[PDB]
Design a protein around this ligand. Structure first.
Ligand SMILES: *[C@@H]1O[C@H](CO)[C@@H](O[C@@H]2O[C@H](CO)[C@@H](O)[C@H](O)[C@H]2NC(C)=O)[C@H](O)[C@H]1NC(C)=O
Ligand SMILES: *[C@@H]1O[C@H](CO)[C@@H](O[C@@H]2O[C@H](CO)[C@@H](O)[C@H](O)[C@H]2NC(C)=O)[C@H](O)[C@H]1NC(C)=O
Ligand SMILES: *[C@@H]1O[C@H](CO)[C@@H](O[C@@H]2O[C@H](CO)[C@@H](O)[C@H](O)[C@H]2NC(C)=O)[C@H](O)[C@H]1NC(C)=O
Ligand SMILES: *[C@@H]1O[C@H](CO)[C@@H](O[C@@H]2O[C@H](CO)[C@@H](O)[C@H](O)[C@H]2NC(C)=O)[C@H](O)[C@H]1NC(C)=O
Ligand SMILES: *[C@@H]1O[C@H](CO)[C@@H](O[C@@H]2O[C@H](CO)[C@@H](O)[C@H](O)[C@H]2NC(C)=O)[C@H](O)[C@H]1NC(C)=O
Ligand SMILES: *[C@@H]1O[C@H](CO)[C@@H](O[C@@H]2O[C@H](CO)[C@@H](O)[C@H](O)[C@H]2NC(C)=O)[C@H](O)[C@H]1NC(C)=O
Ligand SMILES: *[C@@H]1O[C@H](CO)[C@@H](O)[C@H](O)[C@H]1NC(C)=O
Ligand SMILES: *[C@@H]1O[C@H](CO)[C@@H](O)[C@H](O)[C@H]1NC(C)=O
Lengths: 50, 84, 270, 197
């Protein structure tokens, strides 16, 4: 929905309230999203680097 | 091979234990001997013959000369502004 | 400061070699910490072991000698100390070279050597000697004739055992007895946390996120905004590095003092 | 003479100073987001309106680089000062006298020391003493005689299997037990380990 990101998208066990749109924890790190079509919540984590 | 510090490619793990020279991490460390990797050995293990009625009195001596190096000063430099 | 972008990397490439210096400094301090602990603890050439039968004239070292039942091979006091002390953005944490198990092994070797041999193993090879006579020598060192010790052996042993038990109880019950290490950990964690949180500052640009500001404007203005963000983040990073350098220097001084104390008070009478 | 790489500290200090100075000089060639890294060209290509902007960018970049260099120099100077204070302490304590603190000047018991110069530091040669060639023997803490206990003045009781002697702690030199080198205090009923002799 216009939000650009990169990482692995996996199943999330969070509990968004019905009005919620996404979630972040610290420093504007979008941790969890809900898809605009299925309305199913997923979470994002960056792929490995080292 | 996989270790707590990541993984190693090109080295083969061995079950021995030597006082190593190239640290890797988390106790694991490598040496050339094909390159091999192992767990470092803290040193030779010996059991002193402790009792309640025995001592160990030396009978000879040696004299040793050792070195140690300590820096005391570094080069004195100055820097201008307008020319820089 | 760029976070998976090409324009940001290209713009950063023309500011010189600040990042090489930063990486060199951080690597240097890490290696310094490793060498620091290695020189503090690794003082013995060999690894001694206590004999199976323990009769030290009545003294009781049960609560400081390693317990084979515990998988960690750590004594009671070490377990108490360990129990009394309490993720991906571009930063990493390396593990220490020496695992805590080997540190425990060094500690056990030092303690066994000082119990059996005394100060003799600090100069040449370890020399066996009964513990009571070592304690007699230690009194003779401080101006009290050994004539005392042999007439007060049981009383001295009881006093020492009571003292060690009281120390154990005080550590087990009373809290806030390890303020220094906890404070060090708190300082490091807080500095890292504020460095991470600084990443959300506007710094005078129109946004604090690279992708949104890149997918919204033409390159010519992107140059200006990326420049502002880059300079702000670079300043914050430099401040963090300087603080870390100061803290590392102080910690190194403390570790040097600790090594001196270990060498002078454990391996001999000062 | 033969084995090299024994003077790592001084070489590291020299290399660090040289590298820091070299990178400080190298920082001139950077662009810092300006049009060019040479002042004359941008001065000889634009009117002062934007020329002053470019000069400002270059000035602030170079000023930041100079500040960083000065800070690093200060830190290194503090470290060197601490090291040299330790060196002065060792010079005063191990060269002008005999030290007693364990493992301060060499391994083993300290005997004496010699200083030597080095291009940016000092080298100490420590002459020490190390025992060897141990034995086993048998030991007792005190000796009963006529009902009273005798203790050694300085030294320790030993026995090679049949006879008893008194020696010093750091060498083997047995001597016959005599009233001169032993002192008496009370009867022997409290001491644990007395030997009748
Ligand atoms: C001193 O006496 C012991 C026996 O009381 C001799 O035997 C040594 O005992 C220790 C511990 O039991 C072992 O680690 C050694 O290997 C034994 N030595 C042997 C088998 O030769 C000991 O040899 C005697 N001498 C010394 C210098 O310790
Ligand atoms: C070491 O052990 C004890 C305690 O110091 C002493 O000898 C023991 O004495 C008791 C009582 O006479 C006996 O029951 C033991 O068999 C003895 N030997 C032991 C406990 O090992 C003496 O100080 C030392 N004993 C020896 C044999 O060296
Ligand atoms: C103490 O150690 C020294 C050094 O090894 C011994 O001196 C050696 O004695 C042998 C036998 O005569 C000679 O072959 C060596 O040349 C000597 N060494 C030196 C450096 O001169 C000395 O004998 C030992 N002490 C005792 C009591 O045996
Ligand atoms: C050294 O002290 C410990 C701690 O008290 C003693 O261990 C106790 O031993 C008694 C008698 O077997 C037991 O009832 C306790 O439960 C033990 N306490 C613990 C915490 O295990 C140990 O016996 C002492 N050593 C000697 C030689 O007396
Ligand atoms: C323990 O040392 C004493 C003193 O050196 C030895 O006693 C002498 O031993 C020599 C050699 O056997 C004899 O020639 C002397 O006559 C002995 N002197 C006396 C006064 O008896 C003793 O033999 C040594 N014990 C052992 C087991 O070696
Ligand atoms: C050292 O001498 C004393 C005094 O002679 C011994 O003590 C007595 O010895 C006699 C004879 O052996 C015994 O009948 C007594 O019972 C002993 N008295 C006591 C209070 O023990 C002593 O035994 C001698 N030392 C040794 C190791 O036997
Ligand atoms: C969106 O459309 C798809 C296909 O037409 C359908 O499967 C899905 O249920 C729709 N979602 C919503 C929220 O209507
Ligand atoms: C030898 O090393 C392997 C792994 O390389 C390990 O699984 C094994 O336990 C070790 N010891 C023996 C006796 O095989």
């Amino acid at each position: 929905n216009g939000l650009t990101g990169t990482g692995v998208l996996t199943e999330s066990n969070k509990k968004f309230l019905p009005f919620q749109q996404f979630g972040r924890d610290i420093a504007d790190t979008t941790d969890a999203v809900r898809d605009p079509q299925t309305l199913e919540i997923l979470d994002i984590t960056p792929c490995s680097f080292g | 091979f996989q270790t707590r510090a990541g993984c190693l490619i090109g080295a083969e793990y061995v079950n021995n234990s030597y006082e190593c020279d190239i640290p890797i991490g988390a106790g694991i460390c490598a040496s050339y001997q094909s390159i091999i990797a192992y767990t470092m050995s803290l040193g030779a293990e010996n059991s002193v013959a402790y009792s309640n009625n025995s001592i160990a009195i030396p009978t000879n001596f040696t004299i040793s000369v050792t070195t140690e190096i300590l820096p005391v000063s570094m080069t004195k430099t100055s820097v201008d502004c307008t020319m820089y | 400061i760029c976070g998976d972008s090409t324009e940001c990397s290209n713009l950063l490439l023309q500011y010189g070699s600040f990042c090489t210096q930063l990486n060199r400094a951080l690597t240097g301090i890490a290696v310094e910490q490793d060498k620091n602990t290695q020189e503090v603890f690794a003082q013995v050439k060999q690894i001694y072991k206590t004999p199976p039968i323990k009769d030290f004239g009545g003294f009781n070292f049960s609560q400081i000698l390693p317990d084979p039942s515990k998988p960690s091979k750590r004594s009671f006091i070490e377990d108490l100390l360990f129990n009394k002390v309490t993720k991906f953005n571009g930063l990493t944490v390396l593990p220490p070279l020496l695992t805590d198990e080997m540190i425990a092994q060094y500690t056990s070797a030092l303690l066994a050597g000082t119990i059996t041999s005394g100060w003799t193993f600090g100069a040449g090879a370890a020399l066996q000697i009964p513990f009571a006579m070592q304690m007699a020598y230690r009194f003779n060192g401080i101006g009290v004739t050994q004539n005392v010790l042999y007439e007060n052996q049981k009383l001295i042993a009881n006093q020492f055992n009571s003292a060690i038990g009281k120390i154990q109880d005080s550590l087990s019950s009373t809290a806030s007895a390890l303020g220094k290490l906890q404070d060090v950990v708190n300082q490091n964690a807080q500095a890292l946390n504020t460095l991470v949180k600084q990443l959300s500052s506007n710094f005078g640009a129109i946004s604090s996120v690279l992708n949104d500001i890149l997918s919204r404007l033409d390159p010519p203005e992107a140059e200006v905004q990326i420049d502002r963000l880059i300079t702000g983040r670079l300043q914050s990073l430099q401040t963090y590095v300087t603080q870390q350098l100061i803290r590392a220097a102080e910690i190194r001084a403390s570790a040097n003092l600790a090594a001196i104390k270990m060498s002078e008070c454990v391996l001999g009478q000062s | 003479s033969s084995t090299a790489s024994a003077l790592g500290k001084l070489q590291d200090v020299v290399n660090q100073n040289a590298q820091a100075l070299n990178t400080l000089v190298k920082q001139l060639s950077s662009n810092f987001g300006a049009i060019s890294s040479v002042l004359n060209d941008i001065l000889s290509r634009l009117d002062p309106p934007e020329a002053e902007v470019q000069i400002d960018r270059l000035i602030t970049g170079r000023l930041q680089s100079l500040q960083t260099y000065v800070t690093q120099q200060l830190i290194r100077a503090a470290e060197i000062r601490a090291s040299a204070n330790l060196a002065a302490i060792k010079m005063s304590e191990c060269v002008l006298g005999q030290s007693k603190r364990v493992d301060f000047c060499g391994k083993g018991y300290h005997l004496m020391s010699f200083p030597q110069s080095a291009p940016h530091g000092v080298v100490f040669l420590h002459v020490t003493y190390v025992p060897a060639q141990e034995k086993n023997f048998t030991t007792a803490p005190a000796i009963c005689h006529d009902g009273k206990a005798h203790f050694p003045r300085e030294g320790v009781f030993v026995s090679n299997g049949t006879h008893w002697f008194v020696t010093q702690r750091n060498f083997y030199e047995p001597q016959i037990i005599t009233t001169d080198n032993t002192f008496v205090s009370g009867n022997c009923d409290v001491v644990i380990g007395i030997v009748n002799n």
